[PDB]
């Protein structure tokens, strides 16, 4: 039961289901203590069973209990657990993650196969703690708190922090992903090249594995943090190291379109 931005209150439906259950239980206790006839007690017990059913699995038996003035069924525990929106598929087998970004993609013909164009501001946000540490190593900031306070305002950003960010991302790789991720090559590891502008630059040869084109596609970027994750990405997930299809064994990164045309 939480107070939102405007001071209004928002609460879970489980609280209303629990309130139904508790009201009916206390009323049953009072009816028993006051010696009610068996018809009243039977009605109350059947209502108590219905309330327990509503709490555990609403709509399972009988009409689903709704809040007043609404046809929306209250969300029971079973509804929380199962389904595409359920706990398993939404918060256990998959999660929203930190150190991630997203932007429109642009063809980067000048890139090497192991490279991708990464906007400067996206990289500043994605590698922000590394950048704070580097700005503390160099004399750009007295400590990490001052470096963060300095990065907070865009007009306080000087040009030495861009060189520090270049130093930070050295040798490291990022993960590019495009939905739908139909096979494992929907995610690939690339060495980032910092670029002005707000577009991600994608190598042409990998456009077939991503099924990506440039009529408006967007891609997500992820930063593997540990030395272990970085090694996994650079060795196993690097674009230049996956040249053949795991399905057919044929080449996947191969000439196409303009390249074939010119040759």
């Amino acid at each position: 039961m939480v107070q939102v931005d405007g001071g209004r209150f928002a609460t879970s439906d489980l609280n209303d289901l629990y309130r139904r259950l508790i009201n009916r239980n206390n009323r049953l206790k009072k009816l028993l203590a006051q010696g009610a006839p068996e018809i009243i007690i039977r009605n109350e017990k059947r209502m108590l069973q219905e309330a327990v059913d509503a709490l555990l699995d609403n709509g399972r038996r009988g009409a689903p209990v709704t809040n007043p003035g609404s046809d929306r069924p209250l969300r029971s525990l079973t509804d929380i657990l199962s389904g595409k929106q359920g706990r398993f598929r939404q918060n256990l087998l998959g999660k929203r993650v930190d150190y991630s970004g997203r932007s429109v993609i642009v063809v980067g013909p000048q890139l090497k196969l192991h490279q991708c164009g990464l906007p400067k501001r996206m990289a500043l946000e994605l590698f922000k703690p590394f950048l704070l540490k580097k700005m503390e190593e160099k004399g750009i900031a007295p400590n990490v708190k001052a470096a963060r306070r300095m990065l907070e305002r865009q007009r306080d950003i000087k040009d030495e922090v861009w060189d520090a960010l270049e130093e930070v991302i050295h040798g490291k790789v990022v993960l590019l992903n495009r939905a739908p991720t139909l096979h494992r090559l929907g995610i690939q590891a690339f060495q980032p090249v910092l670029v002005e502008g707000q577009s991600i630059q994608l190598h042409p040869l990998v456009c077939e594995a991503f099924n990506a084109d440039f009529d408006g596609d967007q891609m997500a970027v992820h930063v593997p943090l540990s030395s272990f994750a970085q090694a996994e990405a650079r060795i196993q997930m690097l674009s230049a190291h996956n040249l053949l299809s795991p399905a057919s064994g044929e080449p996947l990164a191969k000439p196409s379109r303009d390249i074939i045309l010119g040759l």
Partner: peptide, 14 residues
Amino acid sequence: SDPVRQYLHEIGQV
């Protein structure tokens, strides 16, 4: 299956 109909039937027996 309808609790109200069941309760009304039980009421109608007295």
